[PDB]
Design a protein around this ligand. Structure first.
Ligand SMILES: Cc1cc2nc3c(=O)[nH]c(=O)nc-3n(C[C@H](O)[C@H](O)[C@H](O)COP(=O)(O)OP(=O)(O)OC[C@H]3O[C@@H](n4cnc5c(N)ncnc54)[C@H](O)[C@@H]3O)c2cc1C
Lengths: 759, 516
């Protein structure tokens, strides 16, 4: 350690920050100068050593000087400087220079322990209610100081939100580095309870609700959702569900921490007259509870009290703040700039709160903009692109793994929660015929959709059992059954099986689904009567409803097929034609412009004895002209029916590659077979190996009037899909030749100063 | 002639962990005797400019060595105290009894280079071996220079890496077995002719008279090995309180002023306590407080943060061995020529005598004149009041005054600290940061005003609200409380707020003029 000689200077500065005379605390006139000097020294210190921050930690100057200065300040500038210094001080170490690589050395773990001790002591300082009271008062003073908020005031509000998020993010030191025993549970489990209790006594819930209700929510939506994610840490969905049932400038802090760094731990696992009466009970019990807990600001803070408090928060949160927060987050994620918003926070938001919105049969006029096609389309785009990034960075080591696994586990649950809420709202018949027609039409657009449907083929085929957990497989097969049921009710009736199931569930039944379905019977008691019920129904469509029987006997699961045959869990007749009828089938076993060299490539495809591989993809390269034609058109046609390919829209406005991912195996390993690749490298298209992944690229910018003549030579001209109208644009490929030249895949000191002076 | 060995106590006034005494106690079976000698040449052990407190501390430590020798040797062996030129004494001692080797402790400071070379030329011309063991420092300063590449390490982090590849400093050695050592009795005629002290003298014998100011020493300081070990038991208890709490260095983590001191600065400098014993007794205390409290919630991390101040004292020792002008500017290639003010004897004598008008600076400067020891924060606030945040004088005046009255006046440490507070040599050079304000720092080190009332006997009736800033006390309250400023307590000799803002303006100009 080496600030020891600079310790009295910091001691004097922090003593001169605020002086006490009798009973009235008085701030120094030069407190602004002292604070700005401290902030300049803290920001422009050494990156690796972090000597000044460790000095503030060693001197214990936070609780002695900065917390009383924050408590008893009156002017806005000194309060803003104190808030900025505190925000720069209580930064989580994980956001600081990636501590895991340098943790190994002894000096490294000493620095980690020093910084973690500083964070823990600052949290212990902030456990006092007066500091949070001062912060909440500063919030209110800024908020009702003027109806219109200046951008500097918005930045101050943002700083306050960052302070709250950092204080709530500190207990990661407390969670594992402390390692409590039975002598440390009564204080360790109650530190966070006291923090949350002091936050809710000063009515932070109303502040947050007005904050998302405020029109300037785009300035602080990212820290808003981060603090929402950090509010729940150890409060599981089980007790929440039970309560809902019982209801009826190199360095800085804002960006030097906002590089994603999403909180881990999963931070998760007449009737309308009753809704009216429970809304009145919400406000009445909320006010009676609030006056009770301000009567009990010092009490025993327990976990059930925290659960009740979070219930009273989240019931009105789903009422008012949900749509106003998530639509702003969606618009910010749709921005073309390099966003720092962590996507896993948004995914967590939809998974964790859509079940709360759906279970309470919340009336639709807060939730129309959320239960929509656009968020599901963006969800499947981000799933495709995130699996793309995962299989790109899987070959080369040295990248993050657990954030990618948790982002997969959140995007897969996000598909589950939407369609589960859709099914639950289908079950509810209290809603009128207008929202019935809205649900029917949204289900139509889900029916004629094709992108999330084999996204499950994507994460069931590129799945590795050694890279994920058993709950991921359960979650995935739950999504499989749920989407299959959406296809069985939403598409057979609403679309007349337009995906042609017997052809398209042949994109299932690839026997790479059979193995991981068989691991479910290895944990058959873990699924209970919920997910076991899921899997034989999928098996029944393959065995009984598709013409494949002799193939569904794999030696690894043939013994587990006997495990149900020795368990015999009284299975019903829909699938006793499967466990009992098909076991007898193995108990008694049978053991230029026009046709060119491209024409020599298209007939080769016929030399593969089939042409289904073309129409499998060729439709997409018919569709490459359309979306940027509509972007060129700028008008609206009957959308939803005109699905516009959700995997394509949310990258073409971001103007990147529009990849055709692998989907199903008989067409997936074709992206290693030269007959498919020959037309994918003749005119010049980026190979997946150049992009590192094994999803074939379709790039852009080829002037979509050109993307129909080369598409016409691709495969047949089956225009049954009238999903395009380009009567003007079917003119400028062959009748306007040589708009792009024939170019293909071609590359293109201190002793020093002393000396200086003296000499 | 049986022969005798000579151990000279220039420093390291102890028996435990003395490699010089281990070499002195060797060659017993041949019949080589042992002579313990202290020489009062007016230079050794900091006696060129020595106050009454440091002279008493050296004199009390010499009694403890004599009492230790008279107890282990049951009166056969006793310390020899001389007063003369060391080359004259050793030449006359070699004539009476044949010497074999002179073994000393290595004093690495260049102010002893002329004395050592005179002794080294004496033994080489008299066919006497020369033994110079090093125990005043954890590492040999010339060894650190050689491993760094011919230039001393100019950064604390660069010095910390240089001693990392050197290795851990050695463990303390065994205790000398003086119970069977041979001591030679001399002719009494030779004792008077060589100015041998038959009894241990008084501080008045060296023309160092005890001032009348020393009546208000609330605490008492006692030197020697026996007091060094008893206080070591008290400071390790202070360390153990912090080790069970989770932080290190309690003297700079919780700064306590109005209590008994827990500093091993005076005994460590004179050598009443070995630095290597002090280094390892607080590290082995940290090692077994980490192991047995690992079952508890608080777990330590390990490293060099436990003895972070000891590396600092080696950093100044490393860049002073090859610098004979380490205490000044002319001919010194480490510090800039900062244009200080002309030396004013009126302001300096007001600052030296504790009459500056600031209660913390008055309380601290009167403590040094009475007891000889201040806290590190109290030493920083009086070195900032004279050089940077205040009188803007030369640090050489404060360095010379500190070297005269400190109980632990180390030439390399004090000059290094004075060139850090003035910010002239080392890192954080020419810093325009906040200076140590004595008004604000007094209000929270001693908010009750007990320490200020203890060392300033003019403020008995002054209440705790007014004792830190007596200038805010009105004239009506001044008469009834006996705090008349100007005739009882002096007015502030300078305007602190005006002088601090003026000096940083000149400090920023020196930094800007330093470039090109
Ligand atoms: C203006 C000024 C003058 C000083 N004069 C002396 C002196 O004459 N003799 C002396 O031994 N120390 C001196 N120091 C260093 C330190 O202030 C004193 O040693 C103090 O008494 C130790 O306080 P402590 O109990 O916290 O550390 P201690 O436990 O007393 O320290 C033990 C050892 O560490 C060394 N040390 C501790 N802190 C420092 C530091 N900041 N710089 C260099 N070395 C350090 C000391 O030399 C000592 O031998 C001075 C510091 C300043 C700012």
């Amino acid at each position: 350690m080496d600030w020891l000689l600079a310790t009295p200077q910091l001691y004097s500065a922090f003593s001169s920050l605020g002086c006490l005379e009798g009973d009235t605390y008085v701030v120094n006139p030069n407190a602004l100068a002292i604070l700005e000097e401290i902030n300049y020294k803290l920001t422009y210190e050494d990156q690796t050593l972090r000597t000044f921050r460790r000095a503030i930690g060693f001197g214990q100057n936070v609780r002695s000087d900065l917390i009383p200065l924050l408590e008893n300040a009156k002017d806005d500038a000194v309060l803003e400087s104190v808030i900025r210094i505190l925000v720069n001080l209580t930064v989580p170490v994980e956001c600081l220079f990636s501590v895991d690589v340098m943790y190994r050395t002894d000096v490294g773990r000493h620095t980690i322990f020093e910084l973690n001790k500083l964070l823990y002591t600052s949290k212990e300082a902030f456990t006092e209610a007066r500091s949070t009271k001062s912060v909440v008062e500063y919030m209110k003073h800024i908020l009702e100081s003027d109806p219109k908020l200046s951008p500097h005031k918005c930045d101050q509000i943002n700083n306050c939100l960052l302070l709250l998020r950092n204080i709530l993010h500190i207990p990661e030191t407390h969670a594992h580095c402390v390692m409590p025993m039975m002598q440390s549970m009564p204080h360790g489990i109650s530190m966070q309870n006291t923090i949350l209790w002091n936050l809710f006594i000063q009515s932070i819930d109303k502040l947050l609700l007005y904050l998302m209700t405020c029109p300037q929510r785009a300035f602080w939506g990212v820290t808003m959702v981060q603090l929402i994610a950090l509010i729940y840490k150890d409060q599981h969905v089980s007790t929440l569900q039970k309560l809902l049932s019982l209801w009826f400038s190199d360095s800085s802090d804002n960006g030097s921490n906002g590089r994603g760094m999403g909180g881990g731990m999963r931070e998760g696992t007449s009737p309308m007259d009753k809704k009216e009466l429970r809304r009145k009970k919400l406000v009445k019990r909320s006010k009676s509870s609030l006056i009770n807990m301000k009567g009990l600001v010092q009490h025993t803070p327990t976990d059930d009290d925290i659960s009740n408090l979070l219930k009273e928060f989240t019931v009105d949160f789903l009422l008012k703040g949900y749509s106003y927060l998530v639509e702003e987050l969606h618009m910010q994620l749709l921005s073309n700039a390099k966003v720092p918003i962590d996507t896993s926070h948004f995914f967590w938001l939809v998974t964790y709160f859509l079940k709360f919105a759906a279970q309470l049969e919340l009336d639709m006029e807060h939730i129309d903009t959320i239960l929509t096609y656009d968020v599901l389309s963006y969800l499947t785009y981000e799933g495709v692109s995130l699996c793309e990034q995962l299989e790109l960075n899987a070959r080369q080591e040295g990248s993050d793994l657990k954030p990618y696994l948790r982002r997969m586990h959140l995007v897969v649950t996000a598909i589950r929660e939407f369609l589960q809420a859709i099914d639950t709202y289908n079950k509810v018949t209290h809603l009128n015929e207008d929202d019935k027609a809205h649900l029917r039409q949204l289900q139509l657009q889900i029916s004629e959709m094709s992108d999330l449907r084999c996204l499950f083929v994507l994460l069931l085929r590129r799945f590795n059992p050694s890279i994920h957990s058993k709950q991921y497989l359960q979650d995935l097969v739950v999504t499989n059954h749920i989407l299959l049921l959406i296809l069985d009710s939403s598409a057979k009736l609403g679309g007349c099986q337009t995906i042609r199931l017997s052809e398209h569930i042949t994109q299932f039944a690839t026997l790479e689904v059979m193995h991981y379905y068989g691991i479910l019977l290895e944990d058959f008691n873990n699924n209970g009567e919920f997910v076991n019920d899921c899997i034989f129904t999928m098996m029944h469509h393959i065995g009984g409803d598709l013409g494949q029987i002799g193939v569904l006997f794999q030696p690894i699961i043939l013994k587990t097929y006997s495990r149900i045959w020795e368990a015999d869990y009284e299975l019903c007749d829909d699938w006793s034609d499967l466990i009992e009828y098909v076991i007898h089938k193995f108990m008694n076993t049978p053991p230029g412009k026009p046709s060119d060299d491209v024409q020599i490539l298209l007939d080769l495809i016929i030399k593969e004895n089939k042409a289904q591989h073309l129409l499998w993809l060729q439709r997409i390269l018919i569709e490459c002209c359309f979306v940027k034609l509509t972007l060129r058109s700028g008008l609206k046609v009957p959308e939803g029916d005109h699905i516009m390919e959700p995997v394509a829209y949310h990258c073409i406005c971001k103007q990147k590659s529009i990849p055709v991912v692998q989907w199903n195996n008989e067409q997936s390993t074709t992206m290693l077979y030269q007959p498919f690749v020959l037309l994918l490298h003749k005119l010049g298209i980026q190979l997946p190996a150049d992009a590192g992944s094994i999803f074939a690229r379709i790039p852009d910018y080829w002037t979509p009037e050109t993307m129909y003549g080369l598409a016409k030579k691709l495969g047949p001209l089956d225009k049954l899909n009238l999903k395009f109208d380009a009567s003007e644009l079917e003119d400028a490929t062959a009748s306007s030749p040589s708009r792009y030249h024939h170019t293909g895949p071609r590359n293109s000191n201190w002793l020093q100063l002393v000396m200086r002076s003296k000499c | 002639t049986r022969g005798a060995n000579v151990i000279w106590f220039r420093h390291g006034l102890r028996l435990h962990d003395n490699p010089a005494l281990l070499a002195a106690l060797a060659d017993k079976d041949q019949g080589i005797a042992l002579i313990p000698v202290f020489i009062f040449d007016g230079e050794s052990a900091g006696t060129k400019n020595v106050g009454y407190n440091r002279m008493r501390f050296l004199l009390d430590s010499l009694q403890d060595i004599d009492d230790q020798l008279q107890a282990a040797t049951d009166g056969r062996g006793r310390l020899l105290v001389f007063e003369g030129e060391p080359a004259y004494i050793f030449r006359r001692l070699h004539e009476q009894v044949r010497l074999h080797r002179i073994c000393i402790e290595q004093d690495c400071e260049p102010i002893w280079n002329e004395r050592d070379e005179s002794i080294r030329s004496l033994c080489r011309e008299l066919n006497i071996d020369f033994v110079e063991k090093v125990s005043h420092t954890l590492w040999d300063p010339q060894l650190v220079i050689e491993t760094n590449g011919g230039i001393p390490p100019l950064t604390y982090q660069m010095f910390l890496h240089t001693v990392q590849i050197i290795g851990l400093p050695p463990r303390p050695t065994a205790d000398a077995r003086l119970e069977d050592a041979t001591f030679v009795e001399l002719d009494p005629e030779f004792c008077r002719s060589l100015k041998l002290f038959e009894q241990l003298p008084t501080p008045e014998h060296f023309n160092v008279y005890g001032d009348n100011m020393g009546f208000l020493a609330k605490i008492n300081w006692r030197g020697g090995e026996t007091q060094a070990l008893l206080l070591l038991d008290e400071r390790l208890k202070v360390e153990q309180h912090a080790f069970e709490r989770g932080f290190y260095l309690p003297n700079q983590a919780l700064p306590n002023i109005h209590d008994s001191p827990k500093s091993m600065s005076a005994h460590l400098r004179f050598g009443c306590l070995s630095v290597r014993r002090f280094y390892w007794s607080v590290h082995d205390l940290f090692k077994n407080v980490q192991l047995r409290a690992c079952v508890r919630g608080v777990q330590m991390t390990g490293g060099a943060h436990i003895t972070g101040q000891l590396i600092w004292r080696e950093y100044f020792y490393t860049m002073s061995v090859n610098n004979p002008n380490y205490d000044r500017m002319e001919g010194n290639d480490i510090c800039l020529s900062i244009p200080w003010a002309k030396p004013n004897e009126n302001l300096l004598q007001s600052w030296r005598l504790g009459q500056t008008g600031f209660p913390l600076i008055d309380g601290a400067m009167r403590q040094l004149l009475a007891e000889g020891w201040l806290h590190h924060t109290l030493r920083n606030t009086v070195a900032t009041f004279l050089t940077r945040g205040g009188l803007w004088q030369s640090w050489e005046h404060g360095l010379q005054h500190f070297l005269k009255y400190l109980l632990d006046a180390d030439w390399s440490v004090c000059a290094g600290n004075w060139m850090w507070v003035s910010s002239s040599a080392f890192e954080r050079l020419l810093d325009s940061s906040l200076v140590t304000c004595p008004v604000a720092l007094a209000k929270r080190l001693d908010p009750d005003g007990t320490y200020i009332k203890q060392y300033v006997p003019e403020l008995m009736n002054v209440p705790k609200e007014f004792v830190h800033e007596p200038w805010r006390m009105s004239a009506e309250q001044q008469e009834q409380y006996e705090c008349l400023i100007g005739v009882h307590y002096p007015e502030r000799i300078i305007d602190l707020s005006m002088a601090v803002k003026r000096n940083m303006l000149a400090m920023k100009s020196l930094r800007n003029s330093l470039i090109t």
